[PDB]
Design a protein around this ligand. Sequence first.
Ligand SMILES: Nc1ncnc2c1ncn2[C@@H]1O[C@H](CSCC[C@H](N)C(=O)O)[C@@H](O)[C@H]1O
Ligand SMILES: Nc1ncnc2c1ncn2[C@@H]1O[C@H](CSCC[C@H](N)C(=O)O)[C@@H](O)[C@H]1O
Ligand SMILES: O=C1c2cccc(O)c2C(=O)c2c(O)cc(O)cc21
Ligand SMILES: O=C1c2cccc(O)c2C(=O)c2c(O)cc(O)cc21
Ligand SMILES: [Cl-]
Ligand SMILES: [Cl-]
Ligand SMILES: [Cl-]
Ligand SMILES: [Cl-]
Ligand SMILES: [Cl-]
Ligand SMILES: [Cl-]
Ligand SMILES: [Cl-]
Ligand code: NA
Lengths: 321, 319
Amino acid sequence: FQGSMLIDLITSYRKTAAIYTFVDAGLSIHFKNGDYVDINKLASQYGIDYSRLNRLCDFLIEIGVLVSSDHGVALSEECSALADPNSVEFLTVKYEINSEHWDSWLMYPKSLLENNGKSAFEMVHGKSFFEHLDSNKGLKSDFDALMSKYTNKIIKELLVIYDFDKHNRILDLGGGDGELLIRISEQVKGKDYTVLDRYNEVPISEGINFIKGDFFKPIPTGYDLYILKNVLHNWPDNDAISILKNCREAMDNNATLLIITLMKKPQSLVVKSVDILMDMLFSAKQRYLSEFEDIANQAGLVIRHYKDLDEIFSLIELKVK
Amino acid sequence: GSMLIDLITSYRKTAAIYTFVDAGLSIHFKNGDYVDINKLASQYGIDYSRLNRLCDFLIEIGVLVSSDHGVALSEECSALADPNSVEFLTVKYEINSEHWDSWLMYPKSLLENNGKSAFEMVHGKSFFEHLDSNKGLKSDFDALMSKYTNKIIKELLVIYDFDKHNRILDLGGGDGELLIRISEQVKGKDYTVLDRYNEVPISEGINFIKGDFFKPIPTGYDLYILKNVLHNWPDNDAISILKNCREAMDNNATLLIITLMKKPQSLVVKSVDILMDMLFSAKQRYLSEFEDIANQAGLVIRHYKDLDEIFSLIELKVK
Ligand SMILES: Nc1ncnc2c1ncn2[C@@H]1O[C@H](CSCC[C@H](N)C(=O)O)[C@@H](O)[C@H]1O
Ligand SMILES: Nc1ncnc2c1ncn2[C@@H]1O[C@H](CSCC[C@H](N)C(=O)O)[C@@H](O)[C@H]1O
Ligand SMILES: O=C1c2cccc(O)c2C(=O)c2c(O)cc(O)cc21
Ligand SMILES: O=C1c2cccc(O)c2C(=O)c2c(O)cc(O)cc21
Ligand SMILES: [Cl-]
Ligand SMILES: [Cl-]
Ligand SMILES: [Cl-]
Ligand SMILES: [Cl-]
Ligand SMILES: [Cl-]
Ligand SMILES: [Cl-]
Ligand SMILES: [Cl-]
Ligand code: NA
């Protein structure tokens, strides 16, 4: 950062902005397999001025997103994933960089000073985050698409550290697309997989039953395994404990509730960033093991075992003692 | 990979530093002082939980330093303590709907190729129309511009002799900081600032004129100055300004252009180049591009000098 870094931190949102335009405009797609593209032909396809697009490239080359040739311009080694529409980088841009996040960020300091029931997001949109998602078809599919990435990364080691082979019926609460169950079903075949979530239009996948309901109401029983993945961190204590009450109220002993979340550690850039995001969007938070035990104890739950899948991701086995 | 996702999410770093400054917490961190988060929260009526979480994030990104005392600004981020710092003024000026909403529109402005800038597509009125309407933004704009002028003065006076001039006009001079600073070191001259005012500014030994440089420019000045004006305008409009400059000038009169020159040894120019496209449908220019618009406006580039790494001086005559 060359001696003085504070200014580079402040202006570096411009780097995000430039990458976002490159993606949003729909130009990132033409840079597949490290191909060198002629900007004029590219500019001529989408009806953009050559000069403006050539200049945007010059900035993307400087920051190291693009690379320069005698004929054309290509994506760099480290930024190849911008060409792939099913990469964590492309989907992060698609979901995160928009009015829903950026205008809520500009409201965040006002929400800190105005201590009330309203989150920074609700102060802007006048609705809940998920209420707004269900009204906007495009963002929900972008939300689910990016969430699908974070399930696929734990799926490999989740099946290793836990025995789903020993569970007759399995219910995923706030599962969206059953990406957790879909990927589990592929490995652990011949079991009852159920997904409960708010669907305006219901999704379907072979061997997955998509229940349509609200987890603030009593949750259907008959399931040996209940699972909450990245759900509790969307809610404060009053709302989160109320969800666990409905899990505890639905679990006959001999049954387990699975909770997978970004467990806050003393020193994690990823979790801390997401934690401020939760506060901004839902007036919620990421939690420590002791915070989970406390909210678990409130409804009336105990942890048989806790262990980490990744550095950031951790698993908590919960039962109605 | 690690690099690409860090570039994408690093807006959160900007966003966090903005919340810190905007909320008014920044002022209590002067002279490397360590603040008790609890009393800081209690003072501002902020929930301790929410603040200490925000603070933790600033400690991870490196803005703050944790201790037994409490928390302080890091040596490299000290400038958030100073409310007339280039860093602090950049936050106040640049991190707001005006810029961020215009950035979100920027891809639309590319595809929907028309005269309307990303900013015009959001606000329905030009950047300067919007700035003249809002006293808060203009004061912030002028405050941050004043900082960028103050850096130039020292070596601007060394390479160009204002002492040999007596009637000097600053075109789009705003608050007239350029003439205010030069007037202090160079006395007994007629210093005039031409801009769009509502209540014309006041300063000793500085004349402030209400004017439009798209209309014929006042004659009888021997030095005209355009500093960070032409990068707000596309070629046709930039030519109209330089054309009004030529027609105002005679021989034995000189025009000074102080812009961020599009020279690869400049770090910040290409980022500001995209900022100008987004805000004005304008750009920073290569020397060859200035040569182009100067010739069309009937001007000649006499000399070209490097003020410093980013800033450049162009001397123009009529011919
Ligand atoms: N009242 C409610 N009842 C049930 N599900 C709800 C709900 N409010 C929000 N949700 C759902 O809670 C989910 C939180 S995001 C987590 C998605 C999924 N568990 C995963 O890990 O990939 C969203 O899919 C949202 O639709
Ligand atoms: N038509 C017009 N006539 C005169 N001044 C104009 C103008 N349109 C814009 N301006 C002014 O041109 C200036 C451009 S910004 C440059 C400010 C100053 N020269 C500096 O270096 O900091 C603004 O102050 C703006 O108000
Ligand atoms: O940004 C993230 C994120 C980033 C990296 C890794 C991640 O796991 C996440 C994640 O899980 C997550 C989330 O669950 C809900 C959000 O609103 C945002 C994020
Ligand atoms: O952002 C900048 C800027 C940044 C760094 C260094 C700079 O010099 C500038 C600058 O001059 C400038 C400007 O003249 C007009 C603007 O709207 C924005 C900027
Ligand atoms: Cl959660
Ligand atoms: Cl989210
Ligand atoms: Cl402040
Ligand atoms: Cl206190
Ligand atoms: Cl006006
Ligand atoms: Cl300029
Ligand atoms: Cl030339
Ligand atoms: Na105006």
